[PDB]
Amino acid sequence: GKGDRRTRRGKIWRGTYGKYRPR
Amino acid sequence: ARIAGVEIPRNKRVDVALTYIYGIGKARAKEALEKTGINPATRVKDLTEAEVVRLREYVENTWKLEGELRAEVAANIKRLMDIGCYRGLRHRRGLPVRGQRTRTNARTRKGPRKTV
Amino acid sequence: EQYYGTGRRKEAVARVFLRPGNGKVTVNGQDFNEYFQGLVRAVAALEPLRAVDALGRFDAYITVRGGGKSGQIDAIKLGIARALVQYNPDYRAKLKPLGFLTRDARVVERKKYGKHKARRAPQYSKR
Amino acid sequence: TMNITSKQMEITPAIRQHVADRLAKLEKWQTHLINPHIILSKEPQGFVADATINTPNGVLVASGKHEDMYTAINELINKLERQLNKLQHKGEARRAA
Amino acid sequence: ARRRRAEVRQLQPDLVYGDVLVTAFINKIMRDGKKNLAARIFYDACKIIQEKTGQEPLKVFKQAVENVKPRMEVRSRRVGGANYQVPMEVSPRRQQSLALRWLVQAANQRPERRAAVRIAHELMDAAEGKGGAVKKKEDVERMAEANRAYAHYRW
Amino acid sequence: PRSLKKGVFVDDHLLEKVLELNAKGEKRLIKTWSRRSTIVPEMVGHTIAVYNGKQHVPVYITENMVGHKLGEFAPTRTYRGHG
Amino acid sequence: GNKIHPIGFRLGITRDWESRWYAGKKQYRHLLLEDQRIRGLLEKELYSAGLARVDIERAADNVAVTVHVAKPGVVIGRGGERIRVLREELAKLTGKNVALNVQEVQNPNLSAPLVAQRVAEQIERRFAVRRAIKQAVQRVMESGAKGAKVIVSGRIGGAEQARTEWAAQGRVPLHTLRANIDYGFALARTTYGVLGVKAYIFLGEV
Amino acid sequence: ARKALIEKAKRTPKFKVRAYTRCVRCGRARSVYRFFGLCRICLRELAHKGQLPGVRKASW
Amino acid sequence: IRIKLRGFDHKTLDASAQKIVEAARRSGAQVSGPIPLPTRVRRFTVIRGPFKHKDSREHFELRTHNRLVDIINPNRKTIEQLMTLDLPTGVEIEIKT
RNA sequence: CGGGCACUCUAACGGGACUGCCCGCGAAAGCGGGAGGAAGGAGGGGACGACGUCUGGUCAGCAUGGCCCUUACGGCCUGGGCGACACACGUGCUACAAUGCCCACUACAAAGCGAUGCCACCCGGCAACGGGGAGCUAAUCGCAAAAAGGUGGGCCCAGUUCGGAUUGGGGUCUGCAACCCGACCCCAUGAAGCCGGAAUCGCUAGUAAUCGCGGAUCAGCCAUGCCGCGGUGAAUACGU
Ligand SMILES: [Mg+2]
Ligand SMILES: [Mg+2]
Ligand SMILES: [Mg+2]
Ligand SMILES: [Mg+2]
Ligand SMILES: [Mg+2]
Ligand SMILES: [Mg+2]
Ligand SMILES: [Mg+2]
Ligand SMILES: [Mg+2]
Ligand SMILES: [Mg+2]
Ligand SMILES: [Mg+2]
Ligand SMILES: [Mg+2]
Ligand SMILES: [Mg+2]
Ligand SMILES: [Mg+2]
Ligand SMILES: [Mg+2]
Ligand SMILES: [Mg+2]
Ligand SMILES: [Mg+2]
Ligand SMILES: [Mg+2]
Ligand SMILES: [Mg+2]
Ligand SMILES: [Mg+2]
Ligand SMILES: [Mg+2]
Ligand SMILES: [Mg+2]
Ligand SMILES: [Mg+2]
Ligand SMILES: [Mg+2]
Ligand SMILES: [Mg+2]
Ligand SMILES: [Mg+2]
Ligand SMILES: [Mg+2]
Ligand SMILES: [Mg+2]
Ligand SMILES: [Mg+2]
Ligand SMILES: [Mg+2]
Ligand SMILES: [Mg+2]
Ligand SMILES: [Mg+2]
Ligand SMILES: [Mg+2]
Ligand SMILES: [Mg+2]
Ligand SMILES: [Mg+2]
Ligand SMILES: [Mg+2]
Ligand SMILES: [Mg+2]
Ligand SMILES: [Mg+2]
Ligand SMILES: [Mg+2]
Ligand SMILES: [Mg+2]
Ligand SMILES: [Mg+2]
Ligand SMILES: [Mg+2]
Ligand SMILES: [Zn+2]
Description:
This is part of a larger assembly, with 9 protein chains of 9 kinds.
Chain A: H1 8-14
Chain D: E1 3-6, H1 13-22, E2 34-42, E3 47-55, E4 58-66, H2 69-87
Chain G: E1 19-20, H1 28-45, E2 51-58, E3 62-69, H2 72-76, H3 81-94, E4 97-104, H4 112-124, H5 129-142, E5 147-154, E6 163-170, E7 181-189, E8 194-202
Parallel strand pairs in G: 1-2, 3-4
Antiparallel strand pairs in G: 2-3, 5-6, 5-8, 7-8
Helix pairs in contact in G: 4-5
Chain C binds one RNA strand of 240 nucleotides through residues 4, 6, 10-15, 30, 35-39, 63-72, 96, 101-113, 116-126.
């Protein structure tokens, strides 16, 4: 999951924000 | 092959079975179910034929799907390989295109390993 | 009228205030069950008073900062045991036997150079 | 498979095959040779050939030095054979009592 | 160890039944240090064995442990040339360890989909002498019986 | 890719030789060290020699190769395969 | 090689810094670069006088230098002829109030950076190293030190095969922190190579 | 290629990207800390002497 | 009447935090005791060797200790003596209001 | 906010643990056990690395003997390469799923960093981001959300709502400039992979396992690395 860019867990691993992980 | 040229899995939720259409992910799934006001949790085996033709007409008239999508992606690679750009060369020989390492790994583009 | 104790666990530090009452407990502006909901480790903080039958005799205004939820629970356990020893000096027996009056120095060990973690070594290939 | 490394030298695929053919001598024992790595180099004295092989009964480490390059390869094979011949027979020594 | 006999850790009793045997069973269920999740799976299984069987969960859990505890085990010792299977009695420390470990291992190998069901059902059959956890004991106990001839080689 | 807020990048000194050839009449062969420059519609029809670290590869610009860069058509690696 | 530096291992325990001042994040590297330019011009000039330690103090747009030397006359001069000649070229580079002082070395043979430089000079003059080293430890011990050790590595005497020759006497506990150990290094340049001289003087624990 | 590079890095470049940190003491182009302007080797050499104000060995 | 004191050596910093608290306390009047602010450590990790040998480091640090004293009751008698004080070298003072 | 330094804390200086006391074995040294105590027999971790070995590594960080180059084996610049790919090896990241995946809501850290720097808050946008704009030479203000976890809802054993590779199209930012060769966002594509042969690595308590955060270098970043920080928190040691 941590590698999936289109998920919450995946953007926590990367350290970025988006539609699936807003701030 | 009800929609949209393929048969969507019944007994599954409509927002899920719609992804089984070449050209529709989770994004375009939640899109076509609000534009038609159809409950995404309802199962395909429980759909109203009225709700079918509405979801059919909207989906088939908004995004390119199935064979028409495969033609442009092939044609977009076709022109890339015809003009002679660096990305076209990577498609002609079959090597990775997006600046990836080729000394190791790169096995999806090359396929299983060939002993020597 | 009021009794106080101090407890620490790793980085968690708790200030507990024992007051006579029916048994209500407050943690950082909310009740015990509201701050430790669904945590099995919760019921062990109210154990020092269970060893001296002070279950529903006191109320608890308790704050806590630092560490995680479980470290805060153990910090409460040491704190309310201190406030019971000062509530009754004879409470050292039936509290020190159960180890409630001591504070474990088991803290996170330093991550060291050359290792992946505190002691996890990098995998090597001899030959 | 088998890997060869030429440190601060330049060898041909012909010379690389000769090292592969000399390592066939260890196949005599009918035991698994796990990634035999070979290292060649050039001292002031003569060539040096290293080898670090793993077998299911231990590892093999040896070194050969001689003025002739292929001769040092031979010495390395002689010393590898001896270590291999011991790792496959040392257990058979203490069968009694 | 080489120097002294390694001391046995004393587990703090659980917060529901106050049993050190329950705490040990939790840890073997525990993965990645997630004790809260492992605490649920056991206590929820205590509810599951309560529904399908109207008796005390504490009895079904302890009885199942007695029915997996191996009395004799085999431990290899190469004498001369061949590797013999030497029959040895099992110490009470190791008995709990092997009983709890096979219990969870036999549980996870069950078909049902929720871990609480697997943990509950294995304790249902192990309390009654069934399941892969009890078979592992009978199999270990049959292997030590067949090698009773080599009993004199014990250390 | 480059930002839409910023402009379509051409090395200026290269675009100069382009417009000078569009007035008097195309075309004459242009040698350049501008792999970074983007092909522009005013370049369609000419023949530009793009330097690849060694050679100046002649590249004819067409209608379908406008959105790309010059360095995509003068590759930099001689590779015929293995074996 | 496996030994730690005896001075860096005792900073803030037995020995104090040679540059003692505070600076902000935006000015540390600038004041440090000038601090080495001062010791660059001083270690070259004040070599012939017997330089041992260069202290540097700073406050704000001003800097005070303290030079400990065995022969203060070679640094000061005839009534101050060189001392003023130093402050002139000092502020020419410092661009600020460069106040220069002189400090007396009580015992030169008890200073490690001086013992090393004498041994480095001797072996530069075609002297017997095994014989000069024993004299070096003999002079330091006669001067009341409670332990000494000299180490010279390299082509000693001109031999092709290198060699690390050394001599020691007394007590040199390099593992004790509460022991005072003065340490200095000198570089002896020869027609055949470079020798590394190390000096250890154990003045006595605290 | 050495002194011509410690001299190329000192002058002001044509573009502000081409600026890179070098060692002011020895000229090393890698492992140069901004705070001191020194490399990792010189950071350890001057620290062992005491010529880095307030810098000392760490241990915890 | 805020006086902030920063320095690298806490032994010399506390000596300055003592003399300024003592100075304003004598010549009138109220002084808020020297409070120690949390330090700011600037740690450095570096390979011991000048070549390879990655798993060998030495840790250096730069401790920037902080103090703060407050003269509650001013009186210009203190504002003159503090302009003439022997503060050590490795300590920076900041005075604000 | 008044007010207070009690408490937590922050950071300097001390006290404290020394087999000191008791039982027993002891020739002594010491060993087993108990009490007291926050801590007991080096209290846990770090720093510290003996004479020497590997003619070990480092002339490419530096210095240095020498030998060689001298309209060039010096120096400047542009472009390319260090990013190649029939293959082979080592170290890792992410996975093969229900003790799990996804969505919504809600709690609990420590250590650091921050003046063409960190960005509160508002607004445009699905978003990356952009345009406004307060604070903070920073125990003041900011990075900042800690994540696992907790609550609720969905998925129902499928190459799937596992996995997120590869590829098509559309944007953002840095930068003189992202073709070779940057990161990120969004739509679409949705692979191998069903727990791994011979063989082999790590770890004895806050350790392994698992979860997140910060920093150096740094315009940006190929960092899944390195160095630090805490959250949850085991199993096992008969024996040589
Ligand atoms: Mg996970
Ligand atoms: Mg997915
Ligand atoms: Mg689809
Ligand atoms: Mg940890
Ligand atoms: Mg090879
Ligand atoms: Mg070769
Ligand atoms: Mg080569
Ligand atoms: Mg060797
Ligand atoms: Mg032979
Ligand atoms: Mg297990
Ligand atoms: Mg089993
Ligand atoms: Mg049966
Ligand atoms: Mg050149
Ligand atoms: Mg040089
Ligand atoms: Mg740069
Ligand atoms: Mg740099
Ligand atoms: Mg490493
Ligand atoms: Mg007080
Ligand atoms: Mg003892
Ligand atoms: Mg020691
Ligand atoms: Mg050598
Ligand atoms: Mg040389
Ligand atoms: Mg050199
Ligand atoms: Mg260039
Ligand atoms: Mg260039
Ligand atoms: Mg390049
Ligand atoms: Mg590439
Ligand atoms: Mg091969
Ligand atoms: Mg392989
Ligand atoms: Mg990696
Ligand atoms: Mg499956
Ligand atoms: Mg598929
Ligand atoms: Mg398959
Ligand atoms: Mg999927
Ligand atoms: Mg797994
Ligand atoms: Mg095996
Ligand atoms: Mg150990
Ligand atoms: Mg990180
Ligand atoms: Mg940073
Ligand atoms: Mg960066
Ligand atoms: Mg890449
Ligand atoms: Zn340097």
